């Protein structure tokens, strides 16, 4: 059952721009930040990109490597991967942290699966958004950091 996920999703799609902004990360490179106060259990932004097959993702990764283009892929399911390297949405910029304030979840609609980034606690304005990548040295800078993203 979808519960309130449909309403939450549509509502989020109309105002995700008011929730986030792009800025240089204290962790690494660019990151996504809270543009305003965000309450617990709030759908913040959708991870958007091009849906590719597994072997395509394997080819693309080696191609995205050898040009030093980092990881902008999010696994949708066992057969498909969302590639946001060349095209997609700003959610690609959300960094990894050992102390995450967001969570990445799959919502199954009829028209397809959606990767949704939701808050796991109240997030104040100016805070950098971050979740657990669940995959390399880690630099999230949090107290009691796991030192590694693996």
């Amino acid at each position: 059952p979808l519960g309130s996920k449909s309403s939450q999703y549509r509502k989020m799609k109309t105002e995700w721009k008011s929730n986030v902004y792009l800025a240089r990360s204290r962790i690494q490179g660019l990151g996504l930040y809270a543009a305003r106060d965000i309450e617990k259990h709030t759908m913040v932004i959708e991870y958007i990109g091009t849906i590719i097959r597994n072997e395509v993702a394997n080819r693309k990764e080696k191609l995205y490597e050898s040009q030093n283009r980092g990881v902008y892929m999010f696994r949708m399911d066992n057969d498909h991967v969302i590639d946001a390297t060349l095209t997609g949405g700003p959610a690609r910029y959300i960094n990894h942290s050992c102390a995450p304030n967001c969570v990445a979840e799959v919502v199954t609609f009829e028209r397809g699966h959606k990767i949704i980034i939701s808050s796991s606690r109240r997030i104040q304005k100016g805070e950098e958004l971050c979740y657990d990548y669940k995959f390399i040295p880690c630099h999230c800078g949090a107290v009691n950091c796991r030192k590694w993203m693996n």
Binding site: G49, I51, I52, V56, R59
Partner: peptide, 19 residues
């Protein structure tokens, strides 16, 4: 880089997997 409002399905080319 191009922005997307929604997910799109990748249209693979014939030589997508070739080296």
């Amino acid at each position: 880089f191009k922005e997307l409002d929604e997910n799109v399905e990748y249209e693979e080319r014939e030589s997508e997997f070739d080296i």
